[model samples]
Target: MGPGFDFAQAIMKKNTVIARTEKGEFTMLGVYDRVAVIPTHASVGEIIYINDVETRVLDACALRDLTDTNLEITIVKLDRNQKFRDIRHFLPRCEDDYNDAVLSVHTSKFPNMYIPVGQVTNYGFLNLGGTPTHRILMYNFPTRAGQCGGVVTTTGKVIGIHVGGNGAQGFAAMLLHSYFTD
Candidate 1:
């Protein structure tokens, strides 16, 4: 709204701070590594909006809808031109909403680098290996199809939030942080 940046329907000015620019490219950015004290303020661990990712997706039809199981993750920009390795496992059981077949996203390790802000990459479905997690409390937060590429997280980390599922919550970002993308 300020710079005429439309974060989908609502202005991307809440838990999410920065966002991917047009053409979907990445630029190193750094923000508070803590929580935002004020409302609408951005701090570390908060999600950022996104247009789309270039990484391998979960399915083909998924990309078009934007709310596909091919959910996207959030990244915090670091100086090094690099990425983080996020690998996670999940249980087959899902809610009535999310009933997707187990998929593995074989993504390339970020080579011991931190994810930078505005780095909208695609998903790696082929190597998903299995569900991203077992217990994902997505309902804890409010999500929708509109915010497909929106960043979801407790901190400035990459947490995949599969939009549409068998009413199932998203995968565990903490698990990914520890096991997948540390």
Candidate 2:
């Protein structure tokens, strides 16, 4: 494979996995050693499937209040035999504004597919319960329901994690590095 092919292949084969809970399957990103991150609403405390290997949720960000910034993340433990590599080095630097074109890689009804290139339309806070939380990025890219938790990247570096969206617009969380660091 050429360089572009290798890069895309690495994003699919090495970084992302399918997380199957009792409800359904969603995309999970390997962001740390033996730890993958997903949306907190996906549910926890039960055996789940990561790329078909069984595992369990290690910890989830607590929804302390409607204004909690970490309300959308859940971290899971990878099985001993599983070897999904983290994308820490590919994370955008702290000074990055993430205004560049980006794409999201996930298994939304198919393996190793990506959404079309899209730009971050705006950055603003999501109103939860009369209070605002972490500032999130809004994109014009359309995403399916199962594509949540996919890795959003720009220029081959990670910028955010896909949280959810409809056919018209999408949302992503930019504080992805915090989960691995804290």
Candidate 3:
């Protein structure tokens, strides 16, 4: 709105969709008619690639008003060949920097090998009895690897982004949250 709350002009503006990879690749996919973010479905072994995929936008948990900042891009495939077994594996590890200080007292979850843990929605999961939620922490994490890119998200929302976990436990990186709304 230049002088007044001109709703007409705001609704007619144009936008674009682009991403930069850690491998120094610039992706320009033209004007963003609509955004459809999906998660990467490959594991650490299988090769995963990203081209232009036309899909729906159901996961907008991390859709921020701005797109210039670092985005949390990640993807979770239930049928992935690799899945965590014990519950202890689900908890983020602090082996990068200060594994002793944090993991020493950190016990947000209990180890349970009998239970099945997968990404769940409000449809009803084993441990996630409450409403569906997602948490994201966006910050500068020093890394030797280049920029990593994650699948947008199944719901067409970019929930996960290319990021690293192992760092100094004392210096906490940015922490974000995930929420589901009707």
Give the best candidate by lDDT.
2
TM-scores of all candidate predictions against the true structure: 0.23, 0.77, 0.21
lDDT of 3 by residue, 74-110 (tens): 2212222222221111123221111111100001121
Ranking by lDDT: 2, 1, 3
lDDT of each: 0.24, 0.64, 0.21
lDDT of 2 by residue, 10-100 (tens): 6766777788877677777777677777776677556777768777655544343355454466666755465557577776555245544
Model 2 — which ten-residue stretch has the worst lDDT? 59-68
lDDT of 1 by residue, 1-182 (tens): 22112221121222232233332222212222311111011122223333233322111111111333422233334222233221122211222222111111111211111211222222233212253323232432222222322333222222333332333222221113322222
Predicted structure 3, TM vs. truth: 0.21
| Higher-lDDT candidate of 1 and 2 | 2
| Residue 179, model 2: Cα distance from true site in angstroms | 2.8
For residue 132, give model 3's deviation from the true position in Å.
Answer: 23
Give the C-alpha miss distance for residue 118 in model 2, angstroms: 2.1
Question: Alpha carbon lDDT of residue 153, candidate 3?
Answer: 20
